[PDB]
Amino acid sequence: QAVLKFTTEIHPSCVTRQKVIGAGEFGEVYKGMLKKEVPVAIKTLKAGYTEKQRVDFLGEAGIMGQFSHHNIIRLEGVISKYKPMMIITEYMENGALDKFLREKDGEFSVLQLVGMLRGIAAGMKYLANMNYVHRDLAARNILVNSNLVCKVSDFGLKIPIRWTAPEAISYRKFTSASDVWSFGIVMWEVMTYGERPYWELSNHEVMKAINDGFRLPTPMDCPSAIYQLMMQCWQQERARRPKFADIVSILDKLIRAPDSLKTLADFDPRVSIRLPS
Template structure:
């Protein structure tokens, strides 16, 4: 048995999903800073975590985030360029650097790649990285240069930091100490977080809206399936009728979380574009 610190809010991914859209960007950056600080310490101690993900971060009542679950962690040699090499075993593909997937070599730099995925998870409030893509599709897309686009309402500087963490060459990725310094500067200068990323330099995968033919399929595709009965009960039973849903309509249906409202309205705007319809939502 071991005794660990009690973290009231549990795992970060579940906590973010439960409180979708309820935090300021500064609060989210503060969470990211705490995670980066913990990883910087581990890196300085020559530890490689190998399973860094939002599910393995714990949150206390003050929103302080701490790295946990060291089941896959290993101590490296004194050489900072040393790598831990494994010949088998399952690895979390969506969070793992390409060189670790291909050659089973794990370093602090591969943890940095994983940290970039954690950043994406935090800003998207616990969205699943690469959505419904299969692991093989993820590996192929990454190898071809695809990177996750900026989450909704993500500041440009944060998405750029994610992209820096996802550099193909591990020596080109920032060190955790540099990431901590970058986040500290952003926290001291909140104005730098105002410019939002509108698009990605990589082509996005096909939107889930393109694969939907019913309201139920559409809601499932954007991870809002819990509102199927809300929509049907309000009379929205075809995708055409959904085009005219407004934020006030969502409120009347019982969709109260701001983050969920934003996600649904953003998807509706995509549906409007696909069908050549322009409705003020």
């Protein structure tokens, strides 16, 4: 019971499952309603789950209840006393950030995009300081609310190679510093409205390019300071990367002195259009 110390136990009569929207480790994820009524996402642990699955499922519920931060998905509660067991979270209206960006190409101001990134960074700083290494930080794992607030989540699946730091790929060293690398990729995803990192390079081509010193080029219309910051997230030497504390501080200062974002990094045009004279 102590694992659930930060969670609220929800009675099953409060929950209505409506539509399957995903899979858990041993069960489905549903959109549903929770009693006023509010929409929720509901992850179940169905009959037949193993001991390890139960420990991991209740452990997930417990840590999610512990997290209380504006930029982390909110746990409404847990059903642990009845079967199927359930983890119940808020339901974001705008869905996942990657799809959202791609469906809203060019619709936001630079300040709005940078504000998104500040929120993601604040959530990640909180996770890191709570001793939680995400390991799968990517725009697909971030939800967006109707105030444009980004909420770090984890929707499950092995290694998303092109979001993952070299040391995590090479020797399985996952830390908050490998999450910083991933955050740099997320910065690039946001500023490009959901372009796929490294385009059609294979996983092996990405790893070879990184090891040889190549890095993603600047997004179009990207503030110089923002490109500089994402580039420092991609230092090979893990110790040279900013901490999330540094990232949050820098993004907050840029937003609060917004003229700092008017200077743009040079975009390298991959195609040349010459209007004849």
